[PDB]
């Protein structure tokens, strides 16, 4: 009889989407997950990430 | 170890950079896979070096 | 030391890495090809290929 007098507030709005320009979807500024764009001959990296 | 040559902490070193004039790397003729700096060891190795 | 005609380290790495350009991932064997590029005015010793 006392479970008639319960109240309920809505759950919080929580919006989950992607980041602003797909930020943190591609590794940058890292080594060991560094990207390489390089010749198919010698194969010298043209990407240095710091 | 200073005077006896009984070194034992050589395995903690992780990089060395050499620079002349504070603007030109001595390993700057691109002699190394990691172009600037020698690295003594790798922590986070996914490129198999 | 000799000061000239010995070594010139200008615009050359002292080692290169070559990615596979063929891969066969058979059941008991694996094949890999590499298209080597030995630059002009360079020489390779195959004793240091591994």
UniProtKB/TrEMBL annotation, chain A:
Localization, UniProt: Host nucleus; Virion
Gene induction: Expressed in the late phase of the viral replicative cycle.
Membership in a protein family: Belongs to the adenoviridae hexon protein family.
UniProt miscellaneous comment: All late proteins expressed from the major late promoter are produced by alternative splicing and alternative polyadenylation of the same gene giving rise to non-overlapping ORFs. A leader sequence is present in the N-terminus of all these mRNAs and is recognized by the viral shutoff protein to provide expression although conventional translation via ribosome scanning from the cap has been shut off in the host cell.
Subunit and partners: Homotrimer. Interacts with the capsid vertex protein; this interaction binds the peripentonal hexons to the neighboring penton base. Interacts with the hexon-linking protein; this interaction tethers the hexons surrounding the penton to those situated in the central plate of the facet. Interacts with the hexon-interlacing protein; this interaction lashes the hexons together. Interacts with host dyneins DYNC1LI1 and DYNC1I2; this interaction might be involved in intracellular microtubule-dependent transport of incoming viral capsid.
Cited function: Major capsid protein that self-associates to form 240 hexon trimers, each in the shape of a hexagon, building most of the pseudo T=25 capsid. Assembled into trimeric units with the help of the chaperone shutoff protein. Transported by pre-protein VI to the nucleus where it associates with other structural proteins to form an empty capsid. Might be involved, through its interaction with host dyneins, in the intracellular microtubule-dependent transport of incoming viral capsid to the nucleus.
Protein name (record): Hexon protein
Naturally occurring in which organism (per UniProt): Chimpanzee adenovirus Y25
Full protein stretch here: 299 to 348 of 942
